[PDB]
Amino acid sequence: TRHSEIIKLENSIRELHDMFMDMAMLVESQGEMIDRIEYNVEHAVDYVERAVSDTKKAVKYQS
Amino acid sequence: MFMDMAMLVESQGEMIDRIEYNVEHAVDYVERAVSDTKKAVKYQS
Amino acid sequence: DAGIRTLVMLDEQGEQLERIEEGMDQINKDMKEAEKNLTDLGSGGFIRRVTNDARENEMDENLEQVSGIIGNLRHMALDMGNEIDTQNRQIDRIMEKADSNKTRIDEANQRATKMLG
Amino acid sequence: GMDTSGKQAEAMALLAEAERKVKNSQSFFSGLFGGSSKIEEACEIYARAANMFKMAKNWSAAGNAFCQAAQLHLQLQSKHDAATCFVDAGNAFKKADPQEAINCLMRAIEIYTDMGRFTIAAKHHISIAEIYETELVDVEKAIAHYEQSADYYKGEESNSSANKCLLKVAGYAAQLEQYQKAIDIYEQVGTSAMDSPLLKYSAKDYFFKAALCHFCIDMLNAKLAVQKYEELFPAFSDSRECKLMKKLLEAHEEQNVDSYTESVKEYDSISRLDQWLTTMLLRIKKT
Amino acid sequence: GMDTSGKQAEAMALLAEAERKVKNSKIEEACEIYARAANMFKMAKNWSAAGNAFCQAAQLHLQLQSKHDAATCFVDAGNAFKKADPQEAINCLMRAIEIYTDMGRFTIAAKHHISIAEIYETELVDVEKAIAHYEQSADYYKGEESNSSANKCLLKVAGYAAQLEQYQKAIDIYEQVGTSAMDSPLLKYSAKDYFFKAALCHFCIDMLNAKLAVQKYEELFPAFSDSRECKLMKKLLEAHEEQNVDSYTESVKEYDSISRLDQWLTTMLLRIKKT
Amino acid sequence: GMDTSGKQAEAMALLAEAERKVKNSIEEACEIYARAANMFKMAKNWSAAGNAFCQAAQLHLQLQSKHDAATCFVDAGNAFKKADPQEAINCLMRAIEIYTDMGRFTIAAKHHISIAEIYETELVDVEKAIAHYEQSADYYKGEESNSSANKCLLKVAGYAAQLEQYQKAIDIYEQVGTSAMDSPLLKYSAKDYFFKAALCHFCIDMLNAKLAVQKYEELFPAFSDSRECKLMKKLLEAHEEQNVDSYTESVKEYDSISRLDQWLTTMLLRIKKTIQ
């Protein structure tokens, strides 16, 4: 009985370990990915604002 | 390892919040620009 | 406790991620409509009993409790993992969209400057 | 170091130049009708002054420049940039002068809610409640702001965020010795959270608190509430919380203060207790 | 089934009408209508014909003044052909990768490189061919500082080389990745495993130098001693010192009792033990 | 292979074309420069790609463009990162200056962190790394990003204890631990920081460490139950008797129960050496 219970406990511990490593690596990749999107969207919004401001000033200069 | 996972997840969450704020600003400005364009095109025509 | 906090805050992150995806789709649709309009403008025990004694009991009982808790963790932990996977995909799906959006305005602006002269 | 003196001197010089520019703007407009180019340029100088002052660690000057820019650009009918600068003041004066940040954030909230942008207003309300809580013990204003933010979030259908606001409100209200609101909020959130896959694991905890918050009222209703909760959430029985409550009830049923204290000490030894739980247990022990 | 016939007929009719319209300024409308017809074919689920129409529409879009649309249509055609002639999908995705690289977007190019390598290895038996694409993607990711993707590609190529019996490349990659992970505050827990794998590969060359290699790993990473892998491998080497088959069999059975050994590890163990 | 020679020749041709276009005297020249630098990057000619990027950035900044100029400056900086660390530092300093000018403090803090990283890893310099990390921490704390500021302060305190006086380490560890105790999720780790602080006090004198540990134990009751508290009490008692054997036995037993950071090993070796 000792062998069965002890090996069961060890197997459960190992399973938790492996799956936690997998999930944490996935989280790291996701973190890099979100870091990228932040700058992407910031630059997009800045450029659209700049372009539309140019549009307003040009159209008002012509009218 | 559990304690180690925690703060990574928290940082991801806060950073998501910042992105969400930026997106709301962008969409609001886009809607306002659309309204202005509609006004200009309708009144000039 | 750390496990539970991780789960709840992961759920919140997923909600926020869905919200941003919806907002981005709205932005894309509005941008396309505006551009088109503008173009149209133109288990029995755990320790052997060598001497028995009270000391050998609590030990075993502690182990028992330990085992039970471990069980819970398994299910708990497994569940959490699933969530992350979904988020991964959704996160990817935004970049492309957003990227395309950005590209559009660029060319649009370029066109807005080329028709004039 | 050189940073303090140099940044201060350059910022004062630039701010004086901006003041002269705005002074001459009226004459330019009267004599030539230049439009708003002068005013926009002055606003640019003022925003730059505020940012440099922020770099120079002089938060008061940066906040004053931000407020001036907010006022000037609001005078130009640009309520969006005016609200942006009002929030700039709210976050700059936040540390230099919390009170000014309060009114700045109220102004920004009013401007934003004028357009129906409820999420930003709720975020600002949460920030203001945090400002009230961190420095002042004026709990009532924090509760009001949290309730307003929770109502806004519920009106936006964004669940799991109004929930946290309601939990904060209930926890703070329970401290004021008004238990009905705390009991109702705790039970409502617990019953909502039973059915969620991810949140299920946490649901039990809420019930615990409610029962403890139901304990001060009287013993008998606490017992019957325990029965009601257990029948609805049988897994609750497995948790140590039910065992601890049963032991405490048994000890108190015979005025056995020593057994109650020993059980509390043992439970704390296994897991450290929270200040809120410590206070609630001490209040109960008074009887 | 009625649905397949109905969708096929509808998509055929739409493409025929699109062809008539284009045959009748006109380039943009032709491209759009061909895209609609190819989409309807995709809903009809005739993978070969749908992909052929999609690639023809992509070529016509190339005839039109646009690059991003061209690349998107190329990748869509490659995906459609994914369940068809691998050569056409490979060529279309290679052209899309070239077009993407020309704009400087190396990340999507590396992603497409990985995808084409995956289809090459899974569909065909050529592994060395997939090695080149894997290495190119790894180089692109390393140049862009995406350490995780580069590590994944390096691990895959090292495992393939180890299977191919090029133990030197496998050992170099395994050692480099293991030490890099050990340096990082995170992922350190996994580092041990890499070292262990290297030892096995190094054992293929000889047994005497395996002792020196394990001692070097031990001194470089003391924690590796407490790992069950170190105990198992030292026991296996000591048992192999004497020509007794039972000892290592019992050791591997004991280790396997806890966790099931993977196909690669089991194959490597059989290869070492049989000789 | 064909890649090297072909891309190099095309890059030289494009550079000459852009130089001729500017010789006519403009955005076309910048586009040609960017494309040539990209091809150089594909060619693996890491060096001289940052040169073309810097030239394009200067040409674009000539026409008041600042955002894309900063992006290309950062691009050239990272390109030179491996080929030439010093020019990477310079390009990143320029980008940091411009970004701070527009007030994008998060970008400036990230670039400062990268500068400190490159300074500490490739070159040998701690003071520059400490200054850059402190600047990034100040920027983030001004932006109220608590986690990043805590990380930077912890790194700075660790390095200061490693080489500099212990007062900085004492202050940073005490502050971080005090902030950490109240946090519900982070409370469990608080002990660690406090422990570290105490050890630094020991490097000065035993009595200072004793008073510091008494104050910490009073402030944090849970710290009394920590195995760390028992270990320091035993070590202090052993040191007070000039008995090195007890010191060694306690250290060995604690290491046997749990492995060592190799920082605690250094501090314990320093303390043991001065037992006399």
Backbone angles phi, psi at E221, to 5 degrees: -135, 90
- Please say whether the beta carbons of A56 and C109 come within 8 A: no
Q: CB under 8 Å to F3, separation ≥6 — which residues?
A: F42, F43
Q: What is the resolution of this structure in A?
A: 3.4
D54 — contact with chain F (CB < 8 Å)?
yes
The percent helix, strand, coil of chain C (3-state, each to 5) is 85, 0, 15
Q: CB under 8 Å to E127, separation ≥6 — which residues?
A: E121, E160, E163, E164
Backbone angles phi, psi at E236, to 5 degrees: -60, -45
DSSP E222: G
In this complex, the residue of B12, B15, B33 whose CB is nearest that of residue A52 is B33
Distance CA E64, CA C1 (A): 59
DSSP E260: P
Structure tokens at F255: 């290491």
Structure tokens at D124: 């600002």
- Cα torsion through E193, E195, E198, E203, rounded to 10: -100
Distance CA F273, CA F210 (A): 19
CB distance A51–C112 less than 8 Å? Answer: yes
F188 — contact with chain D (CB < 8 Å)?
no
Widest CA span of chain E, in angstroms?
85
Secondary structure of D114-137 as H, E, C letters: HCCCHHHHHHHHHHHHHHHHHHCC
Q: How many CA atoms lie within 13 A of D69 on its CB side?
A: 29
- Please say whether the beta carbons of D87 and D124 come within 8 A: yes
Q: What is the DSSP string of D72-130?
A: HHHHTT-HHHHHHHHHHHHHHHHHH-HHHHHHHHHHHHHHHHHTT-HHHHHHHHHHHHH
C94 burial via Cβ count (<10 Å: 0-12, 13-18, 19+):
buried
CA distance C64 to chain B (A): 22
Structure tokens at F135: 């600047």
CA distances from residue D79 to A26, D115, D125, F159 in whole angstroms, order as listed: 43, 11, 19, 49
Structure tokens at E39: 């989409």
Structure tokens at E121: 């290895």
Way it was determined: cryo-EM
H or E element: which one contains F57?
A: helix F49-62
**How many beta-carbon pairs below 8 A join chains B and F?**
10
B10 — contact with chain F (CB < 8 Å)?
yes
Distance CA D60, CA D64 (A): 6
**How many beta-carbon pairs below 8 A join chains C and D?**
27
CA distances from residue D221 to D138, D204, D209, D213, D264 in whole angstroms, order as listed: 32, 19, 14, 11, 21
Structure tokens at C102: 């950005």
CB distance C37–B37 less than 8 Å? Answer: yes
Distance CA B14, CA A58 (A): 40
Structure tokens at F254: 């604690």
Report the residue of F64, F67, F145 to disrupt the A interface, i.e. the one with the largest count of A CBs within 10 Å.
F67
E70 burial via Cβ count (<10 Å: 0-12, 13-18, 19+):
buried
Distance CA E166, CA D4 (A): 63
CA distance B15 to chain F (A): 10
Sign of the CA dihedral running D33, D35, D41, D44:
positive
Q: What angle, 0 to 180 degrees and rounded to 10, lies between the N-to-C axes of helices E147-163 and E167-183? A: 150
CA distance B29 to chain F (A): 20
Q: What is the CA radius of gyration of chain A?
A: 27
Report the residue of B28, B30, B31 to disrupt the D interface, i.e. the one with the largest count of D CBs within 10 Å.
B28
Helix, strand or coil for residue C47?
coil
Distance CA D160, CA C17 (A): 13
D190 burial via Cβ count (<10 Å: 0-12, 13-18, 19+):
buried
Distance CA F147, CA F141 (A): 9
Set of chain C residues whose Cβ sits within 8 Å of the Cβ of D159:
15
Instruction: Name the nearest CA neighbour of A47 among E63, C107, D144.
Output: C107
CB distance A23–C106 less than 8 Å? Answer: no
Report the residue of C1, C5, C6, C7 to disrupt the D interface, i.e. the one with the largest count of D CBs within 10 Å.
C7
Instruction: Name the nearest CA neighbour of B2 among E227, F182, A13.
Output: A13
Sign of the CA dihedral running D89, D93, D94, D99:
negative
- Please say whether the beta carbons of F77 and F92 come within 8 A: yes
Angle D143-D145-D151 (CA atoms, 0-180°, nearest 5)? 100
Q: CB under 8 Å to B8, separation ≥6 — which residues?
A: A24, A27, A28, A31
CA distances from residue C14 to C21, C86, C88 in whole angstroms, order as listed: 11, 9, 10
Breaks (C-N over 2.5 A) in chain E follow: 24
Q: CB under 8 Å to D182, separation ≥6 — which residues?
A: D170, D171, D173, D174, D209, D210, D213
B1 — contact with chain A (CB < 8 Å)?
yes
Token pair 């120079």 in the structure block, residue: D56
Angle F180-F181-F183 (CA atoms, 0-180°, nearest 5)? 65
Distance CA D85, CA D71 (A): 8
In this complex, the residue of C6, C34, C41 whose CB is nearest that of residue B34 is C34
In this complex, the residue of F145, F147, F188 whose CB is nearest that of residue B7 is F147
Set of chain D residues whose Cβ sits within 8 Å of the Cβ of B24:
117, 119-120
F183 — contact with chain B (CB < 8 Å)?
no
Distance CA A32, CA A39 (A): 12
Distance CA F101, CA F69 (A): 13
Distance CA D4, CA F239 (A): 47
Q: What is the DSSP string of chain D?
A: -HHHHHHHHHHHHHHHHHHHHHHHHHHHHHHH--TTHHHHHHHHHHHHHHHHHHHTT-HHHHHHHHHHHHHHHHHTT-HHHHHHHHHHHHHHHHHH-HHHHHHHHHHHHHHHHHTT-HHHHHHHHHHHHHHHHHH---HHHHHHHHHHHHHHHHHTT-TTTHHHHHHHHHHHHHHTT-HHHHHHHHHHHHHHHHS-TTTHHHHHHHHHHHHHHHHTT-HHHHHHHHHHHHHH-GGGGGSHHHHHHHHHHHHHHTT-HHHHHHHHHHHHHHSPPPHHHHHHHHHHHT-
Is chain D touching chain E, with at least 3 CB–CB pairs below 8 Å?
Answer: no
Structure tokens at D26: 């009226």
Q: CB under 8 Å to F84, separation ≥6 — which residues?
A: F47, F50
Distance CA B6, CA F185 (A): 8
Distance CA F116, CA F108 (A): 12
- Please say whether the beta carbons of E15 and E43 come within 8 A: no
Structure tokens at D114: 């004028």
Distance CA D235, CA F166 (A): 52
Distance CA D11, CA D5 (A): 10
CB burial of E212-221 (b: ≥16 within 10 Å; e: otherwise) equals ebbeebeeeb
Helices (H), chain A: 2-62
Q: How many CA atoms lie within 13 A of F43 on its CB side?
A: 21
Q: What angle, 0 to 180 degrees and rounded to 10, lies between the N-to-C axes of helices F227-240 and F206-219? A: 160
Structure tokens at E28: 């943009």
- Classify residue C48 as left (phi > 0), alpha (psi -120 to 50) or beta: beta
- Please say whether the beta carbons of F250 and F235 come within 8 A: yes
CB burial of F100-137 (b: ≥16 within 10 Å; e: otherwise) equals beeebbbbbbbbbbbbbebbbeeeeebeebbbbbbbbb
Helix, strand or coil for residue E27?
helix
CB distance F189–B11 less than 8 Å? Answer: no
Distance CA E214, CA E222 (A): 11
Q: What residue in F sits closest to A43 (Cα-Cα)? A: F67
Instruction: Name the nearest CA neighbour of F108 among F75, F82, F132.
Output: F132
Instruction: Name the nearest CA neighbour of E81 among E108, E32, E115.
Output: E115
Distance CA A10, CA A32 (A): 34
Structure tokens at E273: 């033990």
Task: Enumerate neighbours of F (3 or more CB pairs within 8 A).
Answer: A, B, D, E
CA distances from residue D11 to D25, D42, D66, D69, E252 in whole angstroms, order as listed: 21, 14, 13, 15, 75
CA distance D17 to chain C (A): 36
